Amino acid sequence: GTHSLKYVYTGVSRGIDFPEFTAVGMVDDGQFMYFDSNSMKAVPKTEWIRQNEGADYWDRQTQVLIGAHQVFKDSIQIVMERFNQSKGVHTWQNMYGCELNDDGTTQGFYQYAYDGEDFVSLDKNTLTWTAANPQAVITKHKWEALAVAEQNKGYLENTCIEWLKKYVAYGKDTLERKVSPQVSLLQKDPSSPVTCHATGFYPSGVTITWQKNGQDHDEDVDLGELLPNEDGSFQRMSTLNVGPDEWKNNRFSCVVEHQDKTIRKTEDDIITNF
Amino acid sequence: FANFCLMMI
Amino acid sequence: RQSDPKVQVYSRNPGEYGKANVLICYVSGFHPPDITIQLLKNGVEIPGSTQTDLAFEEGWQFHLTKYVDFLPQPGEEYTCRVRHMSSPTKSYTWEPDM
């Protein structure tokens, strides 16, 4: 399957509720490690990574992330100055990572942002940094003179893929798991709109379609957002908003498609608290 | 495993 | 910049009365990060909730989750209360979809 390794760094100059610098690591967008400037320690967040990497791994990861905190602390005082902002709460964000498909092909990105808006981002096809404003052009010129793209690209294509492959091995049972949705048709009261609810699934790709008389029907449909549950799984719902007289004169069904599986619900399935 | 934060902006 | 939190309260499984379930608060698009989240039953904080570690996806939007076991019965009011920055604490009521 397709698997990814990503790191997201949240740095904050003048906040209160959170550490100055937070680092989260994810395989398939699921946390497997954490680090922050309060603990100054990088710790495990999944069993497969703790069973499979000893004290030496967590030591050198903490070292690297204390380097990341310092570089952030300096980095944010400059971008404030370039933007003429000597007062306030400001954020510095960094996210990079890997992708490995079935092809054997690979993809990667390396991106920074200031106050929640694109600052610089790597194009490792051309070994150049895309600046999003004048204030970033100063960094583009500096890093391109310094071979930062050379290092970052070596990381994304080799080092991060090597670590990714070990991680899909360590976590092969969880990471390759395929869990079906539990699907229900919901109704608050006999005239209410009707809701197709799908929950408990992984991976996150789901399709929810409504049907009128056996054919797909995209009128009066409100597809809800992809939301997470408390385990690695996700949920999503869709709502058909038609008057139950159109319910009489037609046969509406919900169809949920996930992985190699398909589930179907009709008016006979409607559950309710009423 | 995380990469070096190599150079400040 | 300052973005208000979008807040979504839902249950893991359909909100059937009398059935043990998981109450979930997903909070996203707030900026800067300083934020607090609580889940309550009739205005009383439910003990034993978990809060994910602060993180964001590729368009730089922060997101956070809090969840807790619960067992929803009629006439109980379940609530997610969110406090972002120095803004006032804002409360969002769980509505079952059945």
Q: What is the DSSP string of A22-73?
A: EEEEEETTEEEEEEETTTTEEEE-SHHHHHH--HHHHHHHHHHHHHHHHHHH
Cβ pair A5, A160 in contact under 8 A: yes
Q: Cβ separation of A272 and C98 shorter than 8 Å? A: yes
Chain A partners within 8 Å of B3 (Cβ): 7, 64, 96, 152, 155, 159-160
Q: Say yes or no: A147 contacts chain B, CB-CB below 8 A.
A: no
The rounded distance, in Å, linking the Cα atoms of A94 and A43 is: 19
Report the alpha-carbon distance of residue A50 to residue C53 in Å, rounded. Answer: 18
Instruction: Determine whether the interchain pair C12/A229 forms a contact, defined as Cβ–Cβ distance below 8 Å.
Output: yes
d(C-alpha A107, C-alpha C71), whole Å: 44
* A111 and C CB contact within 8 Å: yes
Backbone angles phi, psi at C14, to 5 degrees: -50, 140
A95 touches chain C (CB under 8 A): yes
Q: What 8-state DSSP symbol labels residue A267?
A: G
**Residue C46 belongs to what H/E stretch?**
none
**Nearest neighbour of A96 by CB, restricted to B3, B7, B8:** B3
Tokens of A270: 């409607």
Q: Give, as one character, the DSSP assignment of residue A159.
A: I
Closest CA to A242 of A255, A230, A227, A252: A252
Task: Confirm or reject contact between A189 and chain C (CB < 8 A).
Answer: no
Comparing alpha-carbon positions, the chain C residue that sits nearest to A238 is: C97
CA C32/CA A117 separation, integer angstroms: 12
The answer to whether the CB of A24 falls within 8 A of the CB of C53 is: yes
Of A89, A113, A187, the CB nearest to C32: A89
Experimental method: X-ray
Token pair for C5: 């939190």
Chains that touch C (3 or more CB pairs under 8 A): A
Q: Is A16 on the interface with C (CB under 8 A)?
A: yes
For residue A59 the two structure tokens come to: 């030591």
Torsion from C-alpha of C43, C47, C53, C59, nearest 10 degrees: -30
- By C-alpha distance, the chain C residue nearest A113 is C60
> Which helix (H) or strand (E) element contains residue A82?
helix A55-82
B6–A151 CB contact, under 8 Å: yes
Q: What is the resolution of this structure in A?
A: 2.6
Closest partner residue to C35 among A17, A197, A225, by Cβ? Answer: A17
- State the Cα–Cα distance between residues A95 and A22, nearest whole angstrom: 12
> Which positions ≥6 away from A159 have C-beta within 8 Å?
B1, B3
Hey, what amino acid is at A235? Q
Distance (Å, whole) CA A120 – CA A130:
5
Structure tokens given for A207? 């399709």
Cross-chain Cβ contact C32/A272 below 8 Å: no
The phi, psi pair for A197, rounded to 5°, reads -110, 125
Helix (H, G, I), strand (E, B) or coil at A232: coil
Q: Residue A254 pairs with which residues in a beta bridge?
A: A210, A265
Q: Hey, what amino acid is at A69?
A: H
Nearest Cβ partner for C26 among A93, A199, A228: A228
Rounded Cα gap, residues C2 and C48, in angstroms: 31
Q: Which residues of A166-178 are buried (b: 16+ CB within 10 A; e: fewer)?
A: ebbebbeebbeee
A34 forms beta bridges with A24, A43
In order of A17, B9, C32, C63, the CA distances from C84 in angstroms are 10, 30, 9, 13
Report, in this order, helix, strand and coil percent for chain B, each rounded to 5: 0, 0, 100
Query: Is the CB of B1 less than 8 angstroms away from the CB of A148?
Result: no
CA distances from A232 to A26, A48, A175, A256 (A): 12, 14, 10, 19
Interchain contact, A229 vs C22, CB within 8 Å: yes
| Structure-token pair, residue A249 | 């004169």
A83 touches chain C (CB under 8 A): no
Cβ contact A181:A199 at 8 Å: yes
Distance CA C46, CA C79 (A): 10
For residue B1, give the nearest of A96, A148, A163 by CB distance: A163
DSSP E strands: which ranges in chain A? 3-12, 21-27, 30-36, 41-44, 91-100, 106-114, 117-123, 128-131, 182-187, 194-201, 207-212, 215-216, 221-223, 227-228, 234-240, 252-258, 261-265
| CA separation for the pair C72, A48 (Å, rounded) | 34
Domain spans of chain C?
1-98
